[PDB]
Every structure is written in C-alpha cells, then in structure tokens.
Design a protein around this ligand. Sequence first.
Ligand SMILES: Nc1ncnc2c1ncn2[C@@H]1O[C@H](COP(=O)(O)OP(=O)(O)O)[C@@H](O)[C@H]1O
Length: 311
Amino acid sequence: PAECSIKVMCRFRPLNEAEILRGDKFIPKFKGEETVVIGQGKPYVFDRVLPPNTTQEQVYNACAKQIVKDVLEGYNGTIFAYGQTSSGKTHTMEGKLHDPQLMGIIPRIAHDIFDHIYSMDENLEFHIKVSYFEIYLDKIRDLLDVSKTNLAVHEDKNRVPYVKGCTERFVSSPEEVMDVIDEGKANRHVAMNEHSSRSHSIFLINIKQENVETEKKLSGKLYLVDLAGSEKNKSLSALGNVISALAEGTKTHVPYRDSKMTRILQDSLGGNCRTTIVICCSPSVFNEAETKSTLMFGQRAKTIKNTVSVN
Ligand SMILES: Nc1ncnc2c1ncn2[C@@H]1O[C@H](COP(=O)(O)OP(=O)(O)O)[C@@H](O)[C@H]1O
C-alpha cells in the first residue's frame, strides 16, 4: 500500500562570471536545511535545500541514495531535474561524468547500484538493462541508434506506458553504464547547444532480480530524466498541467497523454513509483522571475501522493 510524497529538493547554482562581473548580489536566503527565502517574500519549504556550496556527493546522498535502495527492493524509482536553462540541471544529473568529485547523479547511481549488487549473496541474480533517449518536439529519438528518430509509446499488461523498440545495452559493471552514456553523448554529435537545452534526455535503468532457489522475482524501472529549459515550450506545459491537476486531486483525471514525456512518466507522477524532483535555480535577480515559477512548480509538486508497490 505504502502511500508517500514526491520528495522535492532545491539546488541553487552559484553566480557565474557574467553575473559576478556585472556585480549581482546573492538573492536567496537559507534558513535551516529545508527553507529558502527570496528578499522580503514568503519562505519556501522543501524536503531539502541545497546551496551552491553543497557537493555533488552530498547532493547524491540527499536526493538519490535512497531511491537506489528502493529499486533494489523492487520499487520503481524516478529522479528528475526541473529548471531553467543554465540553472544546473545537467551538472546535477550528469556532472563531469568521469571526475569522482565533480560527477553527478547518474554516474553515482551506477556505482552505488553495483556496490550493492556485488555484496549480495550468490542466488538472487541480477539483470540490468539500460536505455538512453532524448525528446525533441513531441518526438523520441534513440541516443544508442541514431537511425531511430520516432519511437512510439505503448502499454504493458498493467496498462502502464513504456517506450518501444528502444535499443537495450546489458551491463554488469558501473564502467559499462558509463560507456553507454558516453556512446549516447557521442551519437548526439551526429547533429548543438540550443539543441541540448530544449531536448529532454531520459536515461533508463531496468533492474530485474530473481532468487534462484526460491524462484521469486523483484523488478523496477529507474528513470533519470534531465529536462529541458522550463523558461518562457510544449513538453514542460503538459508536465506542469499534469503537475497542476493534483495539488487538489479529486475527480480531475490528469491529461497525461498531453505529451509522450508525461505519458512515459505517468507512473512517476501519481503511480507505483518513488519520485524525487530536483529543482535548480539561479541565485541572481536577473533570473528571479523564473526562479519563483520554478519554486512554485516545486512547492506544488510536494503535495502529490504516489501510491507504490513492490514489483
Ligand atoms: N552547484 C553548482 N556548483 C558549481 N557550478 C555549477 C553548479 N550548478 C551549475 N554549475 C555550472 O553551470 C553549468 C551547468 O549548468 P547546466 O547544467 O547547463 O544548466 P541546465 O542543464 O539546467 O541548462 C556548468 O558550467 C557548471 O560549472
């Protein structure tokens, strides 16, 4: 039965040069470990607040660590990064893919996943399939086979959407999860900045396990989405409307089908999935306007209740 809240974490980048040279004072104010205040305004509260100075490692421990242990326990997970362009979504989700200090969530999840698996007992054998694809103008494009540029969404026995005909790499080590991502990153350059900022890159890790003697199986999808600019569109709207029709709930029946993304994330947004959104904000007043709508989107998101089961 379970019933639990979409966690929501807030990560502010620091000021970059454009700003620091142009002056720019640091607008946001951090009280305790869960609350931020902008100027004289109302104070926002989230599951965590994560200033510029917090490390990748600590961002991981705060937002992701737990979602990993959920997937190994048979639950679906999903983390994603919402926010405006330049706000630090990719740094949080990916980071310097190969630096152990500067590496983001996906590589860390990769390592954490296999440290757990390696330590487990000989029976219960794991298969892990990953896939990597982006979205551009309501169209899915495979990052492991750039031949495929228009995959369709379908539904399983439980009437829940998945992407079909998606290349699948099989992995037995963190290092392979890395080369898969690197493949994808390369494939992209069969084209680019403007492109990336306005594509949604979705990285999917499917983990199936089976206790061999007892023959009982657990399973979970783990979506790790790096969303596009939510600034002032198409795909984010559906998500927002799909994230608006739920602070109230009741009889609304969310559009979901407004976009493929939402259709894929159906289960993440009011289904059998532990979901944790990371919202990324600039600390500059230049950007204040968007920072607030971001925060709105966040604050709203925390109201939603995922009903989750072991799968
Ligand atoms: N918490 C942070 N600490 C240090 N640098 C950051 C942080 N967040 C973002 N950056 C910097 O900003 C850039 C990343 O922003 P980006 O991930 O492109 O935003 P988005 O992907 O949301 O458009 C990088 O050059 C990185 O150095």
